[PDB]
Amino acid sequence: MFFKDKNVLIIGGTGTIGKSILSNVLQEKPKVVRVFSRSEYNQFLLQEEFRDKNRNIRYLIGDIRNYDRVFSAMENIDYVFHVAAMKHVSFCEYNPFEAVLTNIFGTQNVIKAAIAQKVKKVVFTSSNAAISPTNNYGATKLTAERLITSAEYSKGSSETTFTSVRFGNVMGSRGSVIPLFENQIKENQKITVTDLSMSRFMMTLNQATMLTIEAMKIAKGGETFILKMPVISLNDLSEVMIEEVTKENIKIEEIGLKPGEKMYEELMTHDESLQAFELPDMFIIPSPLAKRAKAGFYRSDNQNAISKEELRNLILNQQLLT
Amino acid sequence: HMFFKDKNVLIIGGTGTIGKSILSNVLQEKPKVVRVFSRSEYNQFLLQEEFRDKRNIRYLIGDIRNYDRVFSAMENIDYVFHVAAMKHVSFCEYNPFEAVLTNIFGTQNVIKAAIAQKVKKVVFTSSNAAISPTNNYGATKLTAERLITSAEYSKGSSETTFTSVRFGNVMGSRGSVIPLFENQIKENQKITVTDLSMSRFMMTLNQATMLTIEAMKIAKGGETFILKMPVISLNDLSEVMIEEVTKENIKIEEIGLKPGEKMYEELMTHDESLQAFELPDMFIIPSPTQYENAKRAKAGFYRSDNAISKEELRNLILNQQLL
Amino acid sequence: MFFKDKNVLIIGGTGTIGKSILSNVLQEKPKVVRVFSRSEYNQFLLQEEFRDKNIRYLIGDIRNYDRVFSAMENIDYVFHVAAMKHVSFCEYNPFEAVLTNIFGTQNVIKAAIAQKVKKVVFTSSNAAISPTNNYGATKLTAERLITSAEYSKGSSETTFTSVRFGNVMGSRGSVIPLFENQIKENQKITVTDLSMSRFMMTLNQATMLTIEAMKIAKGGETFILKMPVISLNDLSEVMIEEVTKENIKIEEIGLKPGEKMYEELMTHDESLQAFELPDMFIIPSPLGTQYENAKRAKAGFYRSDQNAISKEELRNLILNQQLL
Amino acid sequence: MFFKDKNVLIIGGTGTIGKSILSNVLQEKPKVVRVFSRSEYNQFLLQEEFRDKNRNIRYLIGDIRNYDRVFSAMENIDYVFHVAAMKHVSFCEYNPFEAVLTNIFGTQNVIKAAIAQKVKKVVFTSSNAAISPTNNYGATKLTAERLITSAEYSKGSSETTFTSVRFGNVMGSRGSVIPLFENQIKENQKITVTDLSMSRFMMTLNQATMLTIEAMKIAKGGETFILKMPVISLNDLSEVMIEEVTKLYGENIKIEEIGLKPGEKMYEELMTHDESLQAFELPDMFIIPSPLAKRAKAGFYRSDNQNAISKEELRNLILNQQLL
Amino acid sequence: MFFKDKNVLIIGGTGTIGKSILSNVLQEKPKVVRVFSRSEYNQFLLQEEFRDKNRNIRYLIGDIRNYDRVFSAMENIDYVFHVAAMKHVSFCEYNPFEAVLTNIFGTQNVIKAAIAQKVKKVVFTSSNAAISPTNNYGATKLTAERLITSAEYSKGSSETTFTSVRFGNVMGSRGSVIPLFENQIKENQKITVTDLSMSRFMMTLNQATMLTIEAMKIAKGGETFILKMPVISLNDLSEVMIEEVTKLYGLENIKIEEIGLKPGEKMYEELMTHDESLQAFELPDMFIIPSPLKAKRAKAGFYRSDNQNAISKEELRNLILNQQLLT
Amino acid sequence: MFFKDKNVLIIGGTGTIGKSILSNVLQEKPKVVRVFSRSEYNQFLLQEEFRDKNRNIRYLIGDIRNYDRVFSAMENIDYVFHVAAMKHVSFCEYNPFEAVLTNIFGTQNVIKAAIAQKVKKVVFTSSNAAISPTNNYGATKLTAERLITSAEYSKGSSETTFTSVRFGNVMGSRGSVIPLFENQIKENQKITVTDLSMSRFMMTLNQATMLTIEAMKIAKGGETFILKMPVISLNDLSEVMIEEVTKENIKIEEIGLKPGEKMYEELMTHDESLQAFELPDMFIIPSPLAKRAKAGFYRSDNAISKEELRNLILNQ
Ligand SMILES: NC(=O)c1ccc[n+]([C@@H]2O[C@H](COP(=O)([O-])OP(=O)(O)OC[C@H]3O[C@@H](n4cnc5c(N)ncnc54)[C@H](OP(=O)(O)O)[C@@H]3O)[C@@H](O)[C@H]2O)c1
Ligand SMILES: NC(=O)c1ccc[n+]([C@@H]2O[C@H](COP(=O)([O-])OP(=O)(O)OC[C@H]3O[C@@H](n4cnc5c(N)ncnc54)[C@H](OP(=O)(O)O)[C@@H]3O)[C@@H](O)[C@H]2O)c1
């Protein structure tokens, strides 16, 4: 229905999530989709993969740090998926200003080009790290989320609607723990662990993709979407993983804790739970500037983690192994 | 006249509550110069006519957003105080990119110019807002804190030293509740109350001033100094204000929460408490070094969530000349 | 009448004249007024002073184009009131004065054209005429910026007018509040050169002059109000007299660097073009517009330099607008 | 030996030539090697590849379009390997301004920042495609080569040294024809072939890696080193690539004519004729001195104008290195 | 005809080709023509030279490195001629980042500004140096040429058209060999010869002017127009120049000093790569190369100045005389 | 003497005064002179003129709106002549912000790059148009002059010292009245006159060259040098010109005032006469942050006669 005959930009289209959004949107036969990123090699690989489907896809090389390039990329465009970002906790500690240029300054650049190019809607892909952040990456997402909600509230005349979406661990994404364990087994027969008492809300690629695309379609403006998500144990994941890659003399090595890392991650602040709504599969938090959700602390701490066996089925079902 | 005697000092943000206090404390120690750096000529004027006889000061108008101006402001300077910021919570939610500019991009400029001009020590003035933040201001100050942390790691060949200092509410500061409620009664016999069940760590002007001067004096880089503080309930504050300002059929309006406001504040994260040192009056969180008789902290949480009494708060206000 | 349900932006609205314009404009029931200034403490206090009375508050620096651009989003009328106004400060920090007064004034013009703003009224000074200091040179360059924009408009409909004041009595960081608070505290007064003279004006006078140009102007004009001349000599005695309610030190501080001994309403060369209303001079751009009640002005100088108002008149002025 | 307890930056250290240069420098026990790349996920892989050798390495995220970030990466550094670029002919024609930012504007940021941080040497990693180019990519290298010679000539009093090295096809390097053909056979069983009569000068990874390190150690500044490389027909390569990839996995496989991509050259050249008139020869190398020991013969050094290798030597070469 | 009552910007109208375009565009009687140049003294001369014709002409001081100023010069303008550049081979090798700013970064500013102001068409003025170049100058012109084609390809929904023209040595144009040799002969009685064996494609000022103006009128967008031009030997040129400059000022026994090549100089020039000659169209007096990114077909082969017969000495002399290239 | 074995940059060295400084400086046999300007064409002409003296001279293309280029141009330089500017009254009126970039914003660039490259002295070339200015150009030189002073006053630790020099009309300079009339007579026989009742202090090319080079050699910092100049009548100039070029049916056209123009020019404000010093052929105005000058207004409001003028012109 929704995207048929429209002009879409996907900023970060070579990344785990951008590629997933591309091909679902492509099924609605859109007039065009434009993939925006910095790295030619990754666009090269993208081009090849879409060999015979490539008529209605276009590949811009650009950096979201550069305004005039965001702007040109945003010409005659209806929908902007803003999915570019520095996502690694450690990299955004060792390089904390670099994290700012991409996540914060890049966001203002995206916002501002969307106002000027009279874009219809913009969907910002945030994280549960933005809640009560222990690290610079999360600080930059909390700032970016403030940037997006401000944009909506001070629009003025603009017809451009601004929205956020909020992820937890997208399972098996670029640089994530699941591929790194799968690799470290096969090659080294040694796993690299931080702290097995750690906790995370996690979610499938499609879960993350559908949230985002549903957001484009339903988004009113100034709101945040948070999917209802299962908690996963880092102990459970390590054992379930070491087992399933074998198809069992692996040495679990304890490396410690990467700078900034949070022991647990939270879907929303308690203060947000006070104004937040509850749908079947998802929460909606309206702009700070129709069913009520239960007030409280939605931590991964507080949730019964799914059991080793329920987790095992989840990995093998979504096929996160090469 | 020990440490600063005949040295060259830059107070960036020196026109303001805390910058002015540092200015007069540092000045007793007989420094060779103190450069006061600030954007607004009205404030430089006012402060300049306050010191008409106290010769030792240069007054530089400029903006920490402009690196070039920060760079020349640091020329031949021994000790920088980075006190400039946007400090209201509400203003950083409604003008959130403006906050990034002053609080983040501005803090880089300090770090980059200090390195380039071979400054001896830089001291950043942060908030307990930067712990487990609920608002853009808090996040910007956490990011700034990490900029200061990283700058100390990446130093390289540089001798320049980067330190943070972390405050809670400096009682009676520019744009704060104690002046507000006072002047709201005076004029409109009305109080604007947000949520009376809020709690804050709060401190005196002198407390924050000496904390910042102490860290400047003894820091080798990487640390974060926190003075331990009385906890203050807003419910008691409202009452004690209505009582003492009258000297009492005064309206109490409930504006409600301003956006992004946090119900309590926190001196440090749980992970920080794991490496924290304890002193009698203070905490020192080191970087990922010995201090005169400091035990290791009690790990755990440091939330304002138990408050000082109403007659204590009365005294604290009255003895401070806050009215 | 004029501002009813229209959209207004006051660049520099926290300040002496900014606030004065703000609330005059608000009386005409305008759809919104956006206040634009940098300093959050000042927006805060003003926010509290308009706690019932429709007003967006934006933090921004005119040195940043992008911020000024979004400030003018969908706006009809703009008041460009922000500058550095101290003479001493613009000599001691001269490049900072270029940034706010010149570069910043571009950003307004450029952004107003960009967002198709209906009218812009620039607040200038007597200082811009035959200037002896950087500030006045910045205001001269501002003025020519504004005139040029109006000429090279092209297809644009944005109109650019200048307004040109003299000392707005009791404005932020000026001598009347200074001397008052100098006596009260120090029993001392800082006097520069007592044979100085100034055209000076009321806060409301300068407010109405600026609201006039908004309503009336077709672009290119520089409006100057006719103004009483005031001796500093007389001001200093009158001040020492009224603030006491006995013996008070009068310190010779001397000239602050760059200061002019007298001020001028227009250049001689402008008097050859100038129009004359009863209480106003309008200088049309060099480039045949009709104003009502207007005859041609008389060629010559318009210096303050002999015909100063009396102490009697002056103390009456200072006492009547409650300036203490 | 040379790099012992030195500080080294590899601008572009994550990709093919950067990684190979890194591990070769590491065997001489330098104090530190820094690695400068934009993409955190490529640094994440490299960082994991050097699991327990890492104490010597630092990982810097940054862009050479950013002077300030290039500058801080150069702090107290002795040796710079400028290896970052857009290197794809197609991408550089469809995004030519991007190519200008990284290949030219970055090269100057490098020059300017090395001068400012008092680096010893900078080796610029250019292509033979900058000679009589038919594309933007080549034009950026020509310009970049021309920036490197200009820095040297007007050094003034800088001790910093500037040199270029000039590769032809580095076999198997990220996003090039050999891994594409293997992959195209594996997944689809089609090879995609532009124009089969194209010829290319091709070198191995270590031929390149050691060209750049030699240059690093030996250069007197303003020079250009190029390695004598064998020619390879694309006729032979495509044939050889199917033969061998089919063997490894399971040769009745399609060949699809694509024709040229925009700006693709038919052959490449190591130096223009003019360069050939003042270049020096060593057994395995040519050295062009600055435009601003044994001397070569003139002529047209092209892939055109030199006998290729045989199918068999080509296959042999491919086997001793890069399949998957 | 075409420019009747239109608005025109000649970015670089103070120079040789920009002035000639100005006066040619002026006879079709447009609403306004704007001149955009950095140098006030050059504008001052032009101003004074157009004593009574100045009324539909405006004089905008400005720099194409400045986007914002390129922007406002283009306001509500219909036809942009981008004729500004550093065009000296030697200068662009010794100041190559300056060449980048003026020749590349400035071309982008034009492109970006022209799209933003909804201009109708733009004609970029390239050189035949862009073909298989041996210098930074020709490096930047290839790149500029490339920016122009890219603009067109991804226009998007912009109606703004982009086209390149492509010149050879424009005779008597500012800072060129002919006024140099004349003046050298006058003032030091000896010329400076790089390398007499060099050959060059050379066109008249009117050939250059008409080429550009035609491409303004005709161009669909993304094409490249090149004029069939005669080859000139520098041997003949140096000889002819000494003869005729002597005949005038009344002096032919004057020194000839071999300087050798300046850095980056090419021996011959080329109108197009061989590759381009396989898609290019021939007209009587002109080739049209279409866009490489998206009616008579020309012959293939290498169109060089060493690969085509010069004019004779005597034809050259006729030319140099009839073009009034002496003073 | 003073410039032997030194490294001199001349910013704007292709134009009237810039060149005059180049060749005088060259007699003192410096190690190097760098000529810095925007225009390749003008450098080209300058390279040809100096063809057999050019080992000493370097030729940089750069715009003083661009810091990094001014900076690199300043590498290892001892003395900087800041002679580049937008100088026409009219061009600075129609193009007012362009004039700010070059005159004001350019000057900050020189100053800031001078401090960084530890340049020994910097001499700024201003105009008496800066006094009580009627035009934007005047506004921008008064602002520039201030910048230079402010740079000296807040140096801090730098050894770089900043100095200004104030010209009136440099006779026969680029784009000026005398070359315009000489050309206008021969080709058209119309002179184009603004207001014949105008007034100007005027000075020889040498005068201004020597003022500037002296300021290099002597200057302590923060001072302005003004040379004692003769006043010339635009009536006397227009006739003297027509007579000598014709050497007289040459019609005179009154075009009127171009925008911004001042009827007279002034060596200093009254306010500066209160602090200025006098010398044989010069005034010295010290930093607002030796013989006293007589106070009063140094307006061009006695002129030199028709005959003294004619001698001045024919003597060059
Ligand atoms: N002449 C030839 O033989 C020849 C052959 C092939 C191609 N071309 C091309 O033809 C074009 C014109 O050649 P031409 O012979 O007429 O050159 P020219 O006489 O030097 O003209 C150059 C023009 O551009 C202006 N300019 C230079 N830099 C500028 C900047 N940054 N911003 C704005 N304006 C600038 C110049 O005036 P100011 O210096 O006053 O700013 C002048 O108006 C050039 O693009 C060149 O590449 C020429
Ligand atoms: N002539 C007088 O009567 C007089 C009177 C008062 C003051 N002055 C002052 O004396 C100085 C020189 O006057 P002049 O007669 O020599 O003028 P001029 O002949 O026009 O010389 C101007 C010089 O500055 C260069 N230039 C212009 N803009 C530039 C920029 N953005 N970046 C770098 N270089 C630039 C010019 O180079 P190009 O080759 O690029 O054009 C040229 O070399 C100026 O500061 C002027 O204001 C002169």
Q: How many CB atoms lie within 10 A of CB F296?
A: 10
Which residues in D42-58 are b (16+ Cβ under 10 Å) and which e? bbbbbbeebeeeeeebb
CA dihedral sign of residues E48, E49, E51, E55: negative
Instruction: Give one word for D222, left, alpha or beta, with left for phi > 0 and alpha for psi -120 to 50.
Output: left
CA distance E206 to chain A (A): 37
DSSP B235-292: HHHHHHHHHHHH----EEEE--PPTT--SS-BSS-HHHHHH-EE-SSEEEE------T
Q: Which residue has the tokens 């399933």?
A: A244
Q: Which chains touch B (3 or more CB pairs under 8 A)?
A: A, C, D, F
CA separation for the pair A287, A221 (Å, rounded): 8
Amino acid symbol at A143:
T
Residues of F in contact with D157 (CB under 8 A): 75-76
Distance (angstroms) between ligand 2 centre and the Cα of F153 equals 26
Please tell me whether residues A104 and A215 are part of one structural domain: yes
Strand partners, D80: D9, D122
CA-nearest of D80, D79, D45 to D59 is: D45
Please tell me whether residues D284 and D315 are part of one structural domain: no
Rounded to a whole number of angstroms, the distance between the first and last alpha carbons of chain C is: 34
Instruction: Please report, for the domain that includes residue B163, its CATH number.
Output: 3.40.50.720
Pocket test for ligand 1, best of E173, E205, E211, E270 (most atoms within 8 A of CB): E173
Strand partners, F9: F34, F80
CA-nearest of F239, A106, A41 to D14 is: A41
Alpha carbon F212 to chain centroid, angstroms = 9
Alpha carbon B58 to chain centroid, angstroms = 23
Please tell me whether residues A114 and A179 are part of one structural domain: no
Between strands C197-201 and C229-231, the pairing is antiparallel
Instruction: Give one word for A222, left, alpha or beta, with left for phi > 0 and alpha for psi -120 to 50.
Output: left
Please tell me whether residues B150 and B273 are part of one structural domain: yes
Cβ(A184)–Cβ(A191) below 8 Å:
yes
CA separation for the pair A89, A129 (Å, rounded): 9
CA separation for the pair F238, B227 (Å, rounded): 81
Cβ(D26)–Cβ(D33) below 8 Å:
yes
Contacts of B217 (CB under 8 A, 6+ apart): B3
Alpha carbon A48 to chain centroid, angstroms = 25
Cβ(F277)–Cβ(F286) below 8 Å:
yes
Please tell me whether residues E90 and E214 are part of one structural domain: yes
Q: How many CB atoms lie within 10 A of CB F102?
A: 27
Instruction: Please report, for the domain that includes residue F192, its CATH number.
Output: 3.90.25.30
CA separation for the pair B241, F14 (Å, rounded): 73
Please tell me whether residues F89 and F11 are part of one structural domain: yes
- Rounded to 5 degrees, what are φ and ψ at D194? -70, -75
Which residues in E35-57 are b (16+ Cβ under 10 Å) and which e? bbbbbbbbbbebbeebeeeeeeb
Q: How many CB atoms lie within 10 A of CB F274?
A: 13
Amino acid symbol at F96:
P
CA separation for the pair F152, F160 (Å, rounded): 8
Q: Indicate contact of D with C: 3+ CB pairs under 8 A.
A: no
Please tell me whether residues E221 and E238 are part of one structural domain: no
Longest pairwise C-alpha distance within chain E? 64
Query: Which of the residues E107, E111, E154 would you substitute to probe the A interface, choosing the one with the greatest number of A C-beta atoms within 10 Å?
Result: E154
Amino acid symbol at E18:
G
Amino acid symbol at B208:
A
Which residues on chain A place their C-beta less than 8 Å from a C-beta of chain C?
Answer: 112, 115, 154, 156-158
Q: What is the 3-state secondary structure (H, E, C) of D180-235?
A: HHHHHHHHCCEEEECCCCCEEEEECHHHHHHHHHHHHHHCCCCCEEEECCCEEEHH
Q: Which residue has the tokens 């004519």?
A: D257
Rg for chain B (alpha carbons), in Å?
20
CA separation for the pair E312, E231 (Å, rounded): 10
Q: What is the DSSP letter of E180?
A: H
Which residues form ligand 2's pocket by a CB distance below 6 Å?
Answer: E 39, 41; F 12-18, 37-39, 42, 63-65, 83-85, 87, 102, 106, 125, 127, 167, 169-170, 173-174
DSSP E157-171: T---EEEEEEE-EET
CA separation for the pair F104, F112 (Å, rounded): 13
CA-nearest of E192, E212, E204 to E257 is: E192
Q: What is the DSSP letter of B156?
A: T
Q: How many CB atoms lie within 10 A of CB B300?
A: 9
Distance (angstroms) between ligand 2 centre and the Cα of F142 equals 16
Q: What is the DSSP letter of D319?
A: H
* Token code pair at residue A164: 């956020």
Q: How many CB atoms lie within 10 A of CB D105?
A: 23
Beta sheet of E231-233, edge-to-edge order? E169-170, E199-203, E231-233
CA separation for the pair B233, B240 (Å, rounded): 11
Cβ(B171)–Cβ(B131) below 8 Å:
no
* Token code pair at residue F21: 């400084």
3-state secondary structure of C78: strand
3-state secondary structure of C276: strand
Number of separate domains in chain D: 2
* Token code pair at residue F309: 């003028």
Q: What residue's CA is closest to ligand 2, atom 47?
A: F87
Q: What residue's CA is closest to ligand 1, atom 37?
A: E37
CA-nearest of F184, F171, F192, F215 to F311 is: F171
Residues of A in contact with C56 (CB under 8 A): 154
Q: What is the DSSP letter of F90?
A: T
Cβ(A120)–Cβ(A78) below 8 Å:
yes
Please tell me whether residues D129 and D218 are part of one structural domain: yes
Strand partners, D35: D10, D59
Q: Answer whether F44 sits within 8 Å of E88, measured CB to CB.
A: yes
Closest ligand 1 atom, residue E85 Cα = 45
Angle at B107 between CA B104 and CA B113, to 5 degrees: 140
Please tell me whether residues B296 and B241 are part of one structural domain: no
Cα torsion at D98, D100, D103, D106 (round to 10°)?
-90
Angle at C241 between CA C238 and CA C247, to 5 degrees: 130
* Token code pair at residue B248: 């009492």
Pocket test for ligand 1, best of F37, F40, F41 (most atoms within 8 A of CB): F41
Contacts of D287 (CB under 8 A, 6+ apart): D223, D224, D225, D279, D280
Structure's resolution in angstroms:
2.7
Residue D302: CA count within 13 A, CB half-sphere: 15
Please tell me whether residues C97 and C148 are part of one structural domain: yes
Q: What residue's CA is closest to ligand 2, atom 12?
A: F83
CA distance F151 to chain B (A): 11
CA separation for the pair A283, A276 (Å, rounded): 7
Between strands C280-283 and C275-276, the pairing is antiparallel
List % helix, strand, coil for chain F (3-state, nearest 5). 40, 20, 40
- Rounded to 5 degrees, what are φ and ψ at C267? -75, 165
Per the structure, the complete domain to which residue D179 belongs is given by 169-203+229-268+303-324
Query: What are the DSSP E strand ranges found in C226-291?
Result: 229-231, 249-252, 275-276, 280-283
Amino acid symbol at B264:
Y
CA separation for the pair A262, B275 (Å, rounded): 16
Q: How many CB atoms lie within 10 A of CB F216?
A: 22
Beta sheet of B224-227, edge-to-edge order? B57-61, B33-38, B8-12, B79-82, B121-127, B161-167, B224-227, B282-285, B277-278, B295-296
CA separation for the pair B129, B103 (Å, rounded): 13
D243-248: long-range contacts, CB 8 A cutoff, minimum separation 24 = D243/D315, D244/D315, D244/D318, D244/D319, D244/D323, D245/D181, D245/D182, D245/D185, D245/D186, D245/D323, D246/D185, D248/D323
Cβ(D160)–Cβ(D119) below 8 Å:
yes
Please tell me whether residues D164 and D242 are part of one structural domain: no
CA-nearest of C303, C289, C66 to C198 is: C303
Q: After which residues is chain A broken (C to N over 2.5 A)?
A: 247, 289
Question: Between B59, B66, B91, which is nearest C40 by CB?
Answer: B91
Which residues form ligand 1's pocket by a CB distance below 6 Å?
Answer: E 12-18, 37-39, 42, 63-65, 83-85, 87, 102, 106, 125, 127, 167, 169-170, 173-174, 176; F 39, 41
* Token code pair at residue D280: 């020096």
Please tell me whether residues D142 and D25 are part of one structural domain: yes
CA-nearest of A145, C60, A108 to B98 is: C60
Angle at D212 between CA D206 and CA D217, to 5 degrees: 120
CA separation for the pair C203, C320 (Å, rounded): 12
Pocket test for ligand 1, best of E170, E200, E202, E207 (most atoms within 8 A of CB): E170
Alpha helices in chain E (DSSP H): 16-27, 40-49, 67-73, 89-94, 96-99, 106-116, 136-154, 177-188, 205-218, 234-249, 274-277, 313-322
Q: What are the Cα distances from residue C297, in Å, to C163, C216, C272?
A: 17, 19, 7
CA separation for the pair C291, C61 (Å, rounded): 35
Alpha helices in chain B (DSSP H): 17-28, 41-50, 67-73, 89-94, 96-99, 106-117, 136-154, 177-188, 205-218, 234-246, 270-275, 310-319
Q: Answer whether A41 sits within 8 Å of D175, measured CB to CB.
A: yes
